[PDB]
From a paper:
Interestingly however, we and others have identified a putative N7-MTase in pp1a (N7-MT-1a) of several members of the large-genome Tobaniviridae family. Here, we confirmed the presence of a Class-1, N7-specific MTase in pp1a of WBV, a member of the Tobaniviridae family. The WBV MTase is therefore RNA Cap-guanine specific, with a strong preference for methylation of an open (GpppN) cap structure.
We present its crystal structure at 1.7 Å resolution, revealing that it adopts a canonical RF secondary structure. The two structures are almost identical, with the exception of the last flexible C-terminal helix that is not visible in the Tantalum-soaked crystal. AdoHcy, the by-product of the methylation reaction, is found in the active-site of both structures. This core structure is formed by a central, seven-stranded β-sheet (ordered β3, β2, β1, β4, β5, β10, β9), flanked by α-helices on each side (α1, α2, α3 on one side, and α4, α5/α6 and α7 on the other). In addition to this central fold, two other structural features are present; a flexible ‘3β-flap’ domain comprised of a short α-helical loop followed by three anti-parallel β-strands (β1 and β6–β8) and an α-helical bundle (β2, α8 and α9) wrapping around α1, herein referred to as the α-bundle region. The first 22 residues of the WBV N7-MT-1a are unresolved in the structure. As with other, class I MTases, AdoHcy binds in a deep, predominantly negatively charged groove, formed by the loops between β1–α2, β2–α3, β3–α4 and β4–α5. The AdoHcy adopts an anti- conformation, similar to that seen in the Ecm1, Hmc1 and ASFV MTase structures.
Author numbering: 24 to 248
C-alpha cells in the first residue's frame, strides 16, 4: 500500500483535490486531457461549468459512463479545440497532459493559445525524473523516447522543451512554481483514509527516492498578467 507508485497516485490526487477546490466559484473550466474522467467526482460537487477535452475518443467513452451533469466531453485535441470552440474559459486545468502537445509544438505557441485566465498545470519534467529506478516507478531515456513505468504500465513519451515552456509561462502569467512534494492536503479519494495518508506523508518525509519522484512532477499556479 506504500509503494512508490501508490504514494505518487495519492499525491497526484492531493494536487488535483486542492487545484479543483481553488477554482473561482462559477468558473467556466477547460480541462485539457480529461481522459477517463478521474476528476469527474471532484468537479461534480462544485459550482463549475466544465469542458473536458481529449484526443483519444476511447478514453472519453469511459468518462461518459459516469460523467457529472456539469461536465461536457469534447473529442478534440487542445489546438483544434481552442480554434473551434465558442466557449469563453475562465479557468484552465491540465493534469499530466500538456507534455503531449508540448512535444509536438513550440511551447510559446501552446502558452499563447491558452485562454487568458487563471490555470493549474501538473506536468512531469522528464529531466528531473530520469534515472529514478524503484520496483513500482521508473523513468529511463531510450534513444529519444522516455519510458515511464508506473507499476505494470508503460507510457512512451516524446521529449519536450521544458526550459522554453517555463519562460513562455513567465511572459504571460504571474507564475507560482512548485511540485507534488509541497502537497499536504488529503486527497478527496475515499479509499485514501486519514491513517493511510499519514503513513504516506511519513514515508515521503523519510525516503529520498519518493521525494525525488514527487519533486519531478511540477506544479504551476498561474494568474494572467
Ligand atoms: N493534444 C492533446 N490535447 C488534449 N488531450 C491530450 C492531448 N494529448 C494527449 N491528451 C490526453 O491527455 C491525457 C493525459 S492522462 C491524464 C488524464 C487526467 N487529466 C487525469 O489527471 O487523470 C490522455 O487522456 C491523453 O489522451
Amino acid at each position: 500500500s506504500l509503494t512508490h507508485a501508490s504514494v505518487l497516485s495519492a499525491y497526484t490526487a492531493s494536487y488535483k483535490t486542492t487545484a479543483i477546490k481553488s477554482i473561482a466559484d462559477n468558473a467556466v473550466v477547460l480541462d485539457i486531457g480529461y481522459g477517463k474522467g478521474n476528476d469527474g467526482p471532484r468537479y461534480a460537487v462544485r459550482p463549475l461549468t466544465v469542458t473536458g477535452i481529449d484526443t483519444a475518443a476511447r478514453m472519453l467513452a469511459i468518462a461518459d459512463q459516469n460523467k457529472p451533469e456539469n461536465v461536457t466531453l469534447v473529442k478534440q485535441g487542445f489546438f483544434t479545440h481552442i480554434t473551434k470552440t465558442s466557449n469563453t474559459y475562465t479557468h484552465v486545468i491540465a493534469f499530466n497532459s500538456l507534455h503531449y502537445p508540448l512535444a509536438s509544438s513550440h511551447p510559446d505557441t501552446l502558452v499563447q493559445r491558452l485562454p487568458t485566465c487563471p490555470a493549474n498545470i501538473l506536468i512531469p519534467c522528464h529531466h528531473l525524473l530520469e534515472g529514478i529506478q524503484t520496483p513500482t516507478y521508473s523513468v529511463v531515456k531510450d534513444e529519444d523516447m522516455w519510458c515511464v513505468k508506473v507499476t505494470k504500465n508503460e507510457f512512451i513519451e516524446s521529449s519536450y522543451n521544458y526550459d522554453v515552456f517555463v519562460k513562455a509561462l513567465e511572459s504571460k502569467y504571474h507564475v507560482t512554481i512548485g511540485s507534488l512534494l509541497d502537497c499536504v492536503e488529503k486527497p478527496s479519494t475515499r479509499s485514501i483514509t486519514p491513517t493511510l495518508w499519514t503513513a504516506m506523508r511519513n514515508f515521503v518525509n523519510n525516503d529520498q527516492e519518493m521525494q525525488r519522484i514527487l519533486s519531478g512532477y511540477i506544479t504551476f499556479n498561474l494568474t494572467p498578467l
